[PDB]
C-alpha cells in the first residue's frame, strides 16, 4: 500500500491523491 509505496521513495502530491476516495 501507500506506506510501502510512499515511505520507500517519496510520493508527489499527485501520487498521494491516488489514495483518496
Partner 1 sequence: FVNQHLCGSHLVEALYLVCGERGFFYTPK
Q: Which residues bind partner 1 (CB under 8 A)?
A: 1-4, 6-14, 16-17, 19-21
Cβ of residue 5: shortest distance to partner 1, in angstroms?
A: 9
Residue 2 to residue 17: CA distance in whole angstroms: 10
Cβ of residue 18: shortest distance to partner 1, in angstroms?
A: 9
DSSP code at position 9: S
* Contact present, 17 and 8 (Cβ < 8 Å): no
Cβ of residue 2: shortest distance to partner 1, in angstroms?
A: 5
Amino acid at each position: 500500500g501507500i506506506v510501502e509505496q510512499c515511505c520507500t521513495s517519496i510520493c508527489s502530491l499527485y501520487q498521494l491523491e491516488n489514495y483518496c476516495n
